[PDB]
Amino acid sequence: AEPTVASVSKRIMHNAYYYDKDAKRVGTDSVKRYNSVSVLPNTTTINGKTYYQVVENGKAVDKYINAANIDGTKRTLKHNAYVYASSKKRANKVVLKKGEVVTTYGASYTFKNGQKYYKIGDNTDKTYVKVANFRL
Ligand SMILES: [Cl-]
Ligand SMILES: [Cl-]
Ligand SMILES: [Cl-]
Ligand SMILES: [Cl-]
């Protein structure tokens, strides 16, 4: 009966638009990683994509966040991979191995070197893996 008793505060892991039920961007705001937003805990599906419905001022509103930006996407490495903070800087000494399941959070990032990277890790750390390592 009260959306604000049911709501959970999810951490945004990739900057996120608000969408309406027609999967069109609504308004001019976006939630920035790694801020949190109040949503209903059960996802819904709009045009074959998974979303969380926003709760604002006591009510479930016609504003939806793509679950890719909160839960991310489970992916498998097709190649061994390093973890990068930026184009040239390694984040750590980890070697992720071919076949490992890794969750990536939202759309890839093109770095200054022109290569694409996904954010990994259930945390605010600057830890990115090359998109190429998820493809054959
Ligand atoms: Cl944005
Ligand atoms: Cl988005
Ligand atoms: Cl690599
Ligand atoms: Cl963290």
Residue numbers in the entry: 310 to 445
Give verbatim excerpts from the published study on this entry.
S-layer proteins (SLPs) are self-assembling, crystalline proteins coating the cell surfaces of many prokaryotes. We determined the atomic resolution structures of all functional domains (I-III from N- to C-termini) present in the three S-layer proteins SlpA_ac, SlpX_ac, and SlpA_amy. The Lactobacillus S-layers are anchored to the cell wall through interaction with teichoic acids (TA), either lipoteichoic acid (LTA) or wall teichoic acid (WTA).
The SlpA protein (~46 kDa) is the main structural component of Lactobacillus acidophilus ATCC 4356 S-layer, built of two domains. The N-terminal region is involved in the self-assembly of the S-layer, whereas the C-terminal part is involved in the attachment to the cell wall. The amino acid sequence of the C-terminal SlpA_III domain is sequentially conserved among Lactobacillus. It consists of two adjacent repeats of the “SlpA-motif,” the “Surface layer protein A motif/domain” (InterPro: IPR024968). This domain is involved in the binding to TAs (teichoic acid binding domain; TAB domain), one of the components of the bacterial cell wall. The crystal structures of the TAB domains (SlpA_ac_III, SlpA_amy_III, and SlpX_ac_III) reveal high structural similarities. The general structure of the TAB domain consists of two cell wall binding motifs (SlpA_motif) which are connected by a short linker and arranged as an internal homodimer. Mapping of the surface charges indicates a large, highly positively charged region within the interface of the two motifs that extends to the C-terminal part of the protein. The four residues observed in the vicinity of phosphates are conserved with the proposed binding motif of YxY….KxxN. SlpA_III, the teichoic acid binding domain, is not involved in the self-assembly and protrudes inward to the bacterial cell.
